[PDB]
Design an enzyme around this catalytic site. Structure first.
Site, short mmCIF file in Angstrom:
data_model
loop_
_atom_site.label_atom_id
_atom_site.label_comp_id
_atom_site.label_asym_id
_atom_site.label_seq_id
_atom_site.Cartn_x
_atom_site.Cartn_y
_atom_site.Cartn_z
CD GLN E 10 18.31 -17.93 -6.22
OE1 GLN E 10 17.59 -18.93 -6.31
NE2 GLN E 10 18.71 -17.25 -7.27
CD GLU E 70 20.07 -14.38 -7.80
OE1 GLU E 70 19.15 -13.93 -8.50
OE2 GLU E 70 20.19 -15.58 -7.50
N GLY E 143 23.67 -23.21 -10.26
CA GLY E 143 24.99 -22.99 -10.86
C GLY E 143 26.01 -22.40 -9.91
CB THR E 144 26.21 -19.24 -8.00
OG1 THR E 144 27.30 -18.60 -7.33
CG2 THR E 144 24.97 -19.18 -7.14
CB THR E 178 13.48 -26.66 -9.09
OG1 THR E 178 12.70 -26.97 -7.94
CG2 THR E 178 13.43 -25.16 -9.32
CG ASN E 205 13.81 -28.42 -0.74
OD1 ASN E 205 14.52 -28.40 0.27
ND2 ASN E 205 13.95 -27.56 -1.73
CG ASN E 227 14.73 -21.78 4.63
OD1 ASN E 227 14.96 -22.84 4.04
ND2 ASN E 227 14.64 -20.62 3.99
CD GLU E 253 34.24 -35.75 22.76
OE1 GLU E 253 33.93 -36.86 23.23
OE2 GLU E 253 34.16 -34.68 23.40
N1 LIG Z 1 14.98 -25.69 1.25
C1 LIG Z 1 15.23 -24.71 0.37
N2 LIG Z 1 15.53 -25.01 -0.91
C2 LIG Z 1 15.77 -23.98 -1.76
C3 LIG Z 1 15.72 -22.67 -1.38
N3 LIG Z 1 16.00 -21.86 -2.45
C4 LIG Z 1 16.23 -22.67 -3.47
N4 LIG Z 1 16.10 -23.99 -3.10
C5 LIG Z 1 16.25 -25.17 -3.95
O1 LIG Z 1 17.58 -25.26 -4.44
C6 LIG Z 1 17.56 -25.50 -5.86
C7 LIG Z 1 17.92 -24.25 -6.60
O2 LIG Z 1 19.24 -23.84 -6.24
P1 LIG Z 1 19.51 -22.26 -6.21
O3 LIG Z 1 19.93 -21.85 -4.84
O4 LIG Z 1 18.32 -21.54 -6.73
O5 LIG Z 1 20.76 -22.05 -7.20
P2 LIG Z 1 21.68 -20.74 -7.08
O6 LIG Z 1 22.58 -20.93 -5.91
O7 LIG Z 1 20.81 -19.53 -7.01
O8 LIG Z 1 22.51 -20.74 -8.45
P3 LIG Z 1 22.19 -19.71 -9.67
O9 LIG Z 1 20.83 -20.05 -10.22
O10 LIG Z 1 23.24 -19.87 -10.73
O11 LIG Z 1 22.22 -18.32 -9.11
C8 LIG Z 1 16.15 -25.96 -6.17
O12 LIG Z 1 16.00 -27.35 -5.94
C9 LIG Z 1 15.33 -25.18 -5.15
O13 LIG Z 1 14.16 -25.89 -4.84
C10 LIG Z 1 15.41 -22.35 -0.05
O14 LIG Z 1 15.36 -21.20 0.37
N5 LIG Z 1 15.17 -23.42 0.82
MG LIG Z 2 20.63 -17.52 -8.11
#
Ligand SMILES: Nc1nc2c(ncn2[C@@H]2O[C@H](COP(=O)(O)OP(=O)(O)OP(=O)(O)O)[C@@H](O)[C@H]2O)c(=O)[nH]1
Ligand SMILES: [Mg+2]
Ligand SMILES: Nc1nc2c(ncn2[C@@H]2O[C@H](COP(=O)(O)OP(=O)(O)OP(=O)(O)O)[C@@H](O)[C@H]2O)c(=O)[nH]1
Ligand SMILES: Nc1nc2c(ncn2[C@@H]2O[C@H](COP(=O)(O)OP(=O)(O)O)[C@@H](O)[C@H]2O)c(=O)[nH]1
Ligand SMILES: [Mg+2]
Lengths: 52, 430, 79, 48, 442, 78, 74, 442
Positions: E10, E70, E143-144, E178, E205, E227, E253
C-alpha cells in the site's frame, strides 16, 4: 497492411513475391544504375570546391 | 472476497431483515431488486454480498433457518422480503421450546442436512471464500442449539477460513427466559472451542442507548436492530469500499487476539446524539474519539474501569486526516495508561475508509478486548451452579438424552476461561 | 440553480430520509392491520408467488467505424 | 528572474483562492445536515 | 542511464502514484502517454530515457512494477486517470492479503505471487542497455511489504548478483504506531535488509508530519503530502543522471563514497527548501542558507538526533542555479561548527553534486517555487538509538509469547525470533564499536 | 510433475496462476481438492448425546496454533 | 469575515468555486433514489487517491474536469 | 514448391476450415475461387501455386482432402460459405464414427474408406510437379483420428515412399479431458506416429486455452480461436516457401537441422506475438523481444516445461521487416541465458530464416496487426514428461482392465496394450539416454 506512403491506390500494398519483385525492382534499380552512370560522367572540380 | 451470512432463530431473522435493508440501501438496490444506484463505486463491489440475477437484478447471499416459519413468514411479506431467494428458507414443523437439547439433538439433526446442503451450495460458487457470518442469541433455543451445531459442521468442513459470530447475551438485571444459564453455558463452551472471534451485545445497553442518549419517545425493536445493523455493516466497510488504509477480518483477528481462547469482544459505535443536541456540537475526529470511549455509546453492561485493555480496534469511515487519528489514539493511551496492559507497547489499531454511511459525514465503530468480560462468565457460572445443585429444570434436558457429564465439562471450561482472564489481568513485568 | 429546489423542502414526506435509528414512523407496531400471514405454506404448495419484472436495454453502440459496420453486416446457372 | 517572479505571484494568488473555498465549503456541509434535521422534527410532530 | 522501480504493497504503490505524477510532469509526458504533438521545443532530448521507454507507436511507458496481494489499490490505479500510461502486465495483484504476518507473506502467500514478479523484472531488464540499479519502495511494518519484500530481494540477489539494490523504507515511528505486531515484523525484516541491500534509506511518518506542520502551514496533513515529499527526494537523487550539470554523480560513485564497511549501509535523509509560497517572499534562499538548513535536526525525515552520534560521510546533491565556489564556501562554513562532528578516521567528509535543472512545481502541490534546492544523504552512528527501541519493545512483548501462535501456525519456527534478535544485537554492537576512538596507539 | 503456468483446476483458492516455477507443489495453500465438497456428508447420524464434546477437543486450525500447512504436500519457502 | 459576516459593510465576495451539487458546470438534477435528494452525491462518492489523481494537475479544483459518477472518469 | 494437406476427423477438419480461410484471405482468392480485377496481384504471379491450382479459366481450387467417418462436419463444410471453393470429390464422408475405439477405426471401419482416400490423394499427386510433403491434422484422442490416421500414414508410407510427412497432432491434455478412453487411444497411436512420421509437432488444447486467456483478453474462448492460432502457425512455417527473403528455409532444412537421430523427431512449437490489440499498442515489438518470447514456457502450444530438459536443436523462422543484426543479437542473447541449456554435443544449436512478408491478420479480435513475427520449432528432452502422465493414466486404467473388452471385441489382441506401453516406455528411455552427458572420456 496499409502502405507507408499515402495516395497509394493498390490495396495489396505489401505482396512481395518472386514475380512482383522481379517485375517491379527491375526497372527501378536499372533506372537508378543508369542515372548514377550518366550523372557521374560530367565531374566538375570547380563546383565541388565551391560546395566544400 | 465473498461473505456468507446465516440468520438463525427469531432474533437472528429480525436483525437480518434490517441488516439487508441497510446493505441494499448502501449499494443502491431497489426493494424490487433492481439496481438504481448513482455511482459506479456502489456497483464495483456488489459481488461481496449479492449474486447477480438476470436483467439487472441482485439477490442476497443469505440462508434463513428457523423451526417455525412465523418470523420468516413476516419478513417475506415485509417491505424488502421479495429480494430473498425462495429456496433459501428452511423450516420444520415444531418449535425449539427454548430448550438447547431439543434444538441441538432432535429437530437439529432432522433439519441440519438441508442447511449444510444450502451452505455448501452457496460456498462452492464463490471464486474466493471469506469467513462465514452468523447472527443469533445465546439464551434462546434454536438460535443457540442449531447455531452451534452448524458452526461445528462448518468448522469441520472449512477449517482454513474465518469463523465470525454476532451474539446476544443475557442482561444482568432481568431475564427474558428462565432456563437462560444452561443454554448460555453450553453455547459458550461450543463457541470457545469452535469460534475464531465472537462479539457480544446486551439488550439492556441498547435500551439505555435509546432512552438516555437518543431520547427517543417511543423506541421499537426496529431501532435496536438498526443499531446492531449499523455496527455490523461498519466492521465490514473496508472490505467493500476504497480507503487510505485498508483492513480485513483476518487482520482484525490477528491484531485483537493475543491467545486463541481470548476471542470474546466488546462493541461500540460513536456518533449517537439527540436531534436537539446535534446543533450544539460539530463532528470532528476528537469528538468521535471522545464519544467512542464515552460509556453512553458502549453496548455492554461491564465497565472498563474494572479491567484492563489487552487490544482495541477503531474503524473510521470518511474523508479525514490520518495525523489527527494517530495523535488522538496516542493521547488516549498516554492519559489513561493504567487501563492498558503494560507489556504490549500499543493496544490500538486504526483503519480509515473513504465512504461513510449515508447521511453522516463520518463514523467510527469500536471493537475492544477487555478482561471485564470475566464478570459476565462468573455471573453465568454462579447461576448455573445454583440451578444444577438442585436439579432445578434438568429433567427436560436429561429427557431429551443429554448426559449430566456434559454440564460439568461446560462449567469446567468456562471456569478455566475465567481463570485465564484473571491470570493475564494481574501479570507483571518483574 | 445548484441548490435543492423548494418543492422538496416545503412538503411532509418520510421517504426522503435514509433508514437509521430513530426513523420509526413507517414500520410494524403502528399498522392498523396486525394479522399474521401464512405466505410460506401457500408458496410451497404452489398457489401464490412473487416475480418482479426485469429491465433490458437495447441501445446500439456509437462511434463505430466503417470496418466495424461492414463486419456487423457480414454477420441459377444463367450465363 | 522576471518570469520566475510572475509565476510565484500567480501561484500565491491561486493558493489564497483555494483557502477561501474550503471555508465556503464547510457551511454547505452544515446545510446538508440541517435539511434532514428539519424534516425529522416535522414528522415527529405529525405522529404526536 | 536506466533505473527500474519496484513498488510493493500500500505505501509503495501510493508513493508510486506521487512519483510517476511528478516524473511525467517534469519530463512533459501527458497522463495518456503521448507527448503534445504541437509542442515543438526544437530538440527532442534523451533525458526521459532514465524513466521512460517508447512502445514503437511513440507512446512513453514507465519502467515500473506495482505489486500487491490485495486487489483494491491496484484496481484503483487501473481505473484512475493514468490508465493508459502503464502497461497492464506491470500492475500485478493477488486475491488476498498477508494479514500483518511476515510469516504469511514469506512462506505461505508471497511464494505463489513471486514468479510473476520475476517474469516482469526479466522483461524490464531485457529492454535496457545501461541498467545501473533497482529502486525499491516498501514498508516493513506490514505483512506483505516485509515478507514479499524480503523474499523478492533474496531472489533478485541470487539472480542478478552484483547489480545494485537501493531501498526506501518506511520504519516504525518511535511512539506513533498503527498496528500491534510491528516489532516482530521489523525485527524479522532487518536480517534481510542487512544482507540484501547496498544502501537503505530510513523514513518515519512522524518526522514528515512534524516537517509539514512546522515548515509548511498545513494543520491536517494526509499521506499524499508525505508521498509528494518522498517523490521530490527521489527526483533530486536521480536528477544527476538526467540533466546537464557541472559535477555529475553516477549511482556507483554514491555507493563508493557513502559506504565505509559492507555492513554499515543505513543512511539518514533530509531536504532543505521545504517552504510555503507566503514564507518564500520574506526570505532570500541562497546556497549557504539551504546548506545550513540540511544540517539542522529539524530538517530530518527520520526521528533521530545526529548530535548524539558522529558523521562518517555526507553526500550533498545541489540542483538548480548553484556555482561550485558557493558550494565550497558553504561546506567550509559547515566544517567550523563544533556541534557537527566527524569520526577522526574520516578527514574528507563530503561528496558534492551540482545539477542545473531546478526542482519542478506541481500545480496542486504545497511546496513553493524555488530557484535552487539541496538534498543530503548521510551515514551516522546515531542510528544505534533507533535499533534500541525496537529491541526493547520486542523483549517486552516476546517475554510472554504474546502473539507467537500466529507465526508458528503460518509456518515459522519459534527459534527464528531469537536468531533475528541476536543478529540485530550484533549490528547494534558494530555501530557502537566503529564510533570508538583509536586510543590503541597510546 | 504438475503442469506449469496453468489456468485450470484451482477454483475456490487464493491462486491466480498456478505453479509458474514448475516444481512439485500444490497450486495453492487452501485445499484445491478435498474429501467432500458440494455433495456434503451425513450429519444426522453423526450426532449423539453419548459422545459429546470434551474439554480442549475442538477442531485444530491455524488460528488455534496448529501448523495445518505441514500436513499437506505444499512446498514452503525455505 | 467569510465565516461570520455580521453587519459589516465590507463583505467578502464569493469566489464562485463552491456549489452545493459540487459541479460549477452542471445544474442540480433529481437523483434516481428518493432518499438521496438531500445528499451531496458528487463529493461523497469519490476515493481519495482518485481525487488527487484528477485534481493534481490543476492549481484549483474547479478547473478540473467533472467527475461524471463513472467508474472510469469522464 | 507444392504441399498437400490431409485433414482427418473432427478437429482436423475444423482446423482445416480455419486454415483455408486464412490462406484464401492472405493470397486474395475470393470464396468463389476467382480473383477480383481491381487487385494489384497480377494474373502472372505464382505465389498461390504452393496451395492452389487453376483449371485454366482462372478459378482456384485447393490441394486438400477432408476425411471423416461421420457426415455432419463435412456436410457443414458443404453447406457453409466455401461450398463453391472445394471440388466435391475432395470432401469424403463415411456413415458412422469409430466410437472412440482405435480398433474400430483401424480394423473394422477405416479399412472400407481408406482406398477411396488413396485414389483421391493419387489424383492430387498426379497434378503436381514439385510436391515436397504431406501436412496432416488429426487428434489422437478420438477413434477415427487415431485409427484412420495411423492406417493412412502406413499406406502413404508404403505407396509414396521417401516423400516427407509432417504431423500436427492434438494430444490428450494432462488434466483437461473430454473422454474416458483417451489414454488407450493415445498410447496405441504413438507407435504409428513413431514409425511413420518424419517430424511430429505436439499440441495441447489446454495450452492454447491458457494462451488465449492469459495473453489474449478472451473470457469465453471457443475452438475457432485455437484453430485460427494453429492456422497462423502453419502460415508462418510455409511462408518461407512462398515469398522472397534474405535467408530462405526449405522444408527439407527443418528435418535436416532439427532431427539429430531418426527416432528423435518429436518437437515443441511456440509462437511469439500472441497479443491483444490493446496490449500490442502498450508495447514495442522489436526482434529481440519476440525472440525472447518464444523461449518462455508461457508461450508454448504444448503443455511442457523445457526447463526440465536440454535442447538439442532450435529452428527460428522470422517473417516480416527483420534485419540480420537483430537475429544474431537475439540468438547470442539466448545462448547467454543460464536457464537455457543445450546438450554439449550440439554446439551450433540454431537455424535461422528471414522472410520479408509480414504475417496476415484475419478479421476478428484474436491477434493484433503486426509488421513482424517469429515462429519456433525445437527438439528437447523435456517432452518425455508429457508421455509420463499418459502412461500413469494408462497404468491406472489397465490395472483393472477397465474397458478392454470393447477393443478385443472390435478385433485387437490383448497383447497390443502391453506392446504399445513397452514401446512408449522405450521412447522415454531413448530420451533419457540421449540427454546423458558424454562422461566416457574420464
Ligand atoms: N508514508 C506512508 N506511509 C504509509 C502509507 N500507507 C501505509 N503506510 C504506513 O505503513 C505501515 C503499514 O504498512 P502497509 O503498507 O499497510 O502493509 P501492507 O504492505 O499493506 O501489508 P498487508 O497489510 O499484509 O497487506 C503503517 O505504519 C502505515 O502508517 C502511505 O501511503 N504513505
Ligand atoms: Mg495491505
Ligand atoms: N483444437 C481443437 N481440438 C478439438 C477440436 N475438436 C475436437 N478437439 C479435441 O480432440 C479430442 C476429440 O477428438 P475428436 O476429433 O472429436 O475424435 P474423432 O476424430 O471425431 O473420432 P470419433 O469420435 O470416433 O469420430 C478432444 O480432446 C477435443 O477436445 C477442434 O476443433 N479444435
Ligand atoms: N435485540 C433483540 N433481541 C431480541 C430480539 N428478539 C428476541 N431477542 C432476545 O433474544 C432472546 C430470545 O431468544 P430467541 O430468539 O427467542 O430464541 P429462539 O426461540 O431459539 O429463536 C431474549 O433475550 C430476547 O430478548 C430482537 O429482535 N432484537
Ligand atoms: Mg468424430
Amino acid at each position: 497492411v496499409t502502405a507507408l506512403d499515402q495516395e497509394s491506390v493498390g490495396m495489396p500494398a505489401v505482396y512481395k513475391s518472386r514475380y512482383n519483385l522481379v517485375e517491379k525492382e527491375g526497372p527501378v534499380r536499372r533506372e537508378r544504375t543508369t542515372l548514377m552512370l550518366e550523372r557521374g560522367k560530367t565531374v566538375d572540380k570547380k563546383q565541388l570546391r565551391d560546395t566544400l | 472476497r465473498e461473505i456468507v451470512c446465516v440468520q438463525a432463530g427469531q432474533c437472528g431473522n429480525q436483525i437480518g431483515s434490517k441488516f439487508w435493508e441497510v446493505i441494499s440501501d448502501e449499494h443502491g438496490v431497489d426493494p424490487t431488486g433492481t439496481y438504481q444506484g448513482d455511482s459506479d463505486l456502489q456497483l464495483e463491489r456488489i459481488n461481496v454480498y449479492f449474486d447477480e440475477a438476470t436483467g439487472g437484478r441482485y439477490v442476497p447471499r443469505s440462508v434463513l433457518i428457523d423451526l417455525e416459519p412465523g418470523t420468516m413468514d413476516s419478513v417475506r411479506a415485509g417491505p424488502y422480503g421479495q429480494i430473498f431467494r425462495p429456496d433459501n428458507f428452511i423450516f420444520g414443523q415444531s418449535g425449539a421450546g427454548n430448550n438447547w437439547a431439543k434444538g441441538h439433538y432432535t429437530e437439529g439433526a432432522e433439519l441440519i442436512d438441508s442447511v449444510l446442503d444450502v451452505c455448501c451450495k452457496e460456498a462452492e460458487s464463490c471464486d474466493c471464500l471469506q469467513g462465514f457470518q452468523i447472527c443469533h442469541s445465546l439464551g434462546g433455543g434454536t438460535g443457540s442449539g442449531m447455531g452451534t451445531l452448524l458452526i461445528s459442521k462448518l468448522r469441520e468442513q472449512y477449517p482454513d477460513r474465518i469463523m465470525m459470530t454476532f451474539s446476544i447475551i443475557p442482561s444482568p438485571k432481568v431475564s427474558d427466559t428462565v432456563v437462560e444459564p444452561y443454554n448460555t453455558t453450553l453455547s459458550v463452551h461450543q463457541l470457545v472451542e469452535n469460534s475464531d472471534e465472537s462479539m457480544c451485545i446486551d439488550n439492556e445497553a441498547l435500551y439505555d442507548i435509546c432512552f438516555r442518549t437518543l431520547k427517543l419517545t417511543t423506541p421499537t425493536f426496529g431501532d435496536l436492530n438498526h443499531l446492531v445493523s449499523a455496527v455490523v455493516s461498519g466492521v465490514t466497510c473496508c472490505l467493500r469500499f476504497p480507503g487510505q488504509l485498508n483492513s480485513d477480518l483476518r487482520k482484525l483477528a490477528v491484531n485483537l487476539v493475543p491467545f486463541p481462547r481470548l476471542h470474546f469482544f466488546m462493541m461500540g459505535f460513536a456518533p449517537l446524539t439527540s436531534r436537539g443536541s446535534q446543533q450544539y456540537r460539530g463532528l470532528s475526529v476528537p469528538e468521535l474519539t471522545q464519544q467512542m470511549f464515552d460509556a453512553k455509546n458502549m453496548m455492554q453492561a461491564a465497565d472498563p474501569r474494572h479491567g484492563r485493555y489487552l487490544t482495541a480496534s477503531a474503524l473510521f469511515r470518511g474523508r479525514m486526516s490520518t495525523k489527527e487519528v494517530d495523535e488522538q489514539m496516542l493521547n488516549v493511551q498516554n492519559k489513561n495508561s493504567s487501563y492498558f496492559i503494560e507489556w504490549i507497547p500499543n493496544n490500538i489499531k486504526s483503519s480509515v475508509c473513504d465512504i461513510p454511511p449515508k447521511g453522516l459525514k463520518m463514523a467510527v465503530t469500536f471493537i475492544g478486548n477487555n478482561t471485564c468480560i470475566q464478570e459476565m462468565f462468573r455471573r453465568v457460572g454462579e447461576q448455573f451452579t445454583l440451578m444444577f445443585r438442585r436439579k432445578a429444570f434438568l429433567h427436560w434436558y436429561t429427557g431429551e438424552g443429554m448426559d449430566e457429564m456434559e454440564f460439568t465439562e461446560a462449567e469446567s471450561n468456562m471456569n478455566d476461561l475465567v481463570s485465564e482472564y484473571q491470570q493475564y489481568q494481574d501479570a507483571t513485568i518483574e | 440553480e445548484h441548490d435543492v429546489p423548494v418543492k422538496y423542502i416545503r412538503t411532509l414526506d418520510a421517504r426522503l430520509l435514509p433508514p437509521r435509528v430513530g426513523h420509526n414512523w413507517l414500520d410494524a407496531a403502528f399498522r392498523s392491520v396486525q394479522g399474521k400471514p401464512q405466505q410460506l405454506e401457500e408458496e410451497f404448495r404452489g398457489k401464490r408467488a412473487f416475480m418482479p419484472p426485469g429491465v433490458y436495454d437495447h441501445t446500439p453502440p456509437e462511434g463505430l467505424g466503417l470496418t466495424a459496420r461492414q463486419l456487423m453486416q457480414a454477420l441459377d446457372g444463367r450465363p | 528572474k522576471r518570469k520566475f517572479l510572475e509565476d510565484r505571484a500567480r501561484q500565491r494568488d491561486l493558493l489564497r483562492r483555494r483557502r477561501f473555498m474550503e471555508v465556503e465549503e464547510e457551511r454547505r456541509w452544515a446545510q446538508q445536515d440541517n435539511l434532514q434535521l428539519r424534516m425529522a422534527n416535522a414528522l415527529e410532530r405529525q405522529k404526536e | 542511464r536506466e533505473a527500474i522501480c519496484i513498488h510493493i504493497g500500500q505505501a509503495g504503490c501510493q508513493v508510486g502514484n506521487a512519483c510517476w505524477e511528478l516524473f511525467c510532469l517534469e519530463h512533459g509526458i501527458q497522463p495518456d502517454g503521448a507527448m503534445p504533438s504541437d509542442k515543438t521545443i526544437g530538440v527532442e532530448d534523451d533525458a526521459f530515457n532514465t524513466f521512460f521507454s517508447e512502445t514503437g507507436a511513440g507512446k512513453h511507458v514507465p519502467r515500473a512494477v506495482f505489486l500487491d496481494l490485495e486487489p483494491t489499490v491496484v484496481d484503483e490505479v487501473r481505473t484512475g486517470t493514468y490508465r493508459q500510461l502503464f502497461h497492464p502486465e506491470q500492475l500485478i495483484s493477488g486475491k488476498e492479503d498477508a494479514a500483518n504476518n511476515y510469516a504469511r507473506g514469506h512462506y505461505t502467500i508471497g511464494k505463489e505471487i513471486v514468479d510473476l514478479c520475476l517474469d516482469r523484472i526479466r522483461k524490464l531488464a531485457d529492454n535496457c542497455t545501461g541498467l545501473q540499479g533497482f529502486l525499491v519502495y516498501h514498508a516493513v511494518g506490514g505483512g506483505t511489504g516485509s515478507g514479499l519484500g524480503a523474499l523478492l530481494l533474496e531472489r533478485l540477489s541470487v539472480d542478478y548478483g552484483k547489480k545494485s539494490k537501493l531501498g526506501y523504507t518506511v520504519y516504525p515511528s518511535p511512539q506513533v504506531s498503527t498496528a500491534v505486531v510491528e516489532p516482530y515484523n521489523s525485527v524479522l525484516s532487518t536480517h534481510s535488509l542487512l544482507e540484501h541491500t547496498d544502501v537503505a534509506a530510513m523514513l518515519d511518518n512522524e518526522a514528515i508530519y512534524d516537517l509539514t506542520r512546522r515548515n509548511l502551514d498545513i494543520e491536517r496533513p494526509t499521506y499524499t503530502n508525505l508521498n509528494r515529499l518522498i517523490g521530490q527526494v527521489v527526483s533530486s537523487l536521480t536528477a544527476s543522471l538526467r540533466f546537464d550539470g557541472a559535477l555529475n554523480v553516477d549511482l556507483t560513485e554514491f555507493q563508493t563514497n557513502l559506504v565505509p564497511y559492507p555492513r554499515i549501509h543505513f543512511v539518514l535523509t533530509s531536504y532543505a527548501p521545504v517552504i510555503s509560497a507566503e514564507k518564500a517572499y520574506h526570505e532570500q534562499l541562497s546556497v549557504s542558507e539551504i546548506s545550513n538548513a540540511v544540517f539542522e535536526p529539524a530538517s530530518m525525515m527520520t526521528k533521530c538526533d545526529p548530535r548524539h552520534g558522529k558523521y562518517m560521510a555526507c553526500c550533498l546533491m545541489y540542483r538548480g542555479d548553484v556555482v561550485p565556489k558557493d558550494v565550497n564556501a558553504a561546506v567550509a562554513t559547515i566544517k567550523t561548527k563544533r556541534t557537527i562532528q566527524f569520526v577522526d578516521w574520516s578527514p574528507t567528509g563530503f561528496k558534492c553534486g551540482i545539477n542545473y535543472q531546478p526542482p519542478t512545481v506541481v500545480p496542486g502541490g504545497d511546496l513553493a517555487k524555488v530557484q535552487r534546492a539541496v538534498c543530503m544523504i548521510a551515514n551516522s552512528t546515531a542510528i544505534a538509538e533507533v535499533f534500541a527501541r525496537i529491541d526493547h519493545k520486542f523483549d517486552l512483548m516476546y517475554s510472554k509469547r504474546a502473539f507467537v501462535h500466529w507465526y508458528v501456525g503460518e509456518g515459522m519456527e519459534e527459534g527464528e525470533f531469537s536468531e533475528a534478535r541476536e543478529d540485530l544485537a550484533a549490528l547494534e554492537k558494530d555501530y557502537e564499536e566503529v564510533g570508538a576512538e583509536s586510543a590503541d596507539m597510546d | 510433475a504438475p503442469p506449469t503456468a496453468s489456468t485450470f483446476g484451482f477454483h475456490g483458492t487464493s491462486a491466480v496462476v498456478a505453479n509458474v516455477g514448475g516444481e512439485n507443489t500444490e497450486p495453492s495453500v487452501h485445499p484445491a481438492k478435498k474429501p467432500t465438497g458440494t455433495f456434503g456428508r451425513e450429519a444426522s447420524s453423526s450426532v449423539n448425546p453419548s459422545k459429546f464434546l470434551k474439554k480442549n477437543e475442538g477442531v485444530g486450525t491455524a488460528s488455534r496454533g496448529v501448523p495445518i500447512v505441514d500436513a499437506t504436500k505444499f512446498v514452503k519457502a525455505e | 469575515r467569510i465565516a461570520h459576516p455580521g453587519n459589516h459593510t465590507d463583505r467578502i465576495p464569493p469566489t464562485g468555486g463552491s456549489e452545493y451539487n459540487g459541479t460549477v458546470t452542471e445544474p442540480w438534477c433529481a437523483p434516481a433514489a428518493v432518499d438521496n435528494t438531500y445528499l451531496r452525491l458528487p463529493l461523497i462518492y469519490e476515493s481519495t487517491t482518485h481525487y488527487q489523481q484528477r485534481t493534481g494537475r490543476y492549481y484549483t479544483e474547479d478547473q478540473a474536469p467533472p467527475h461524471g459518477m463513472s467508474l472510469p472518469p469522464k
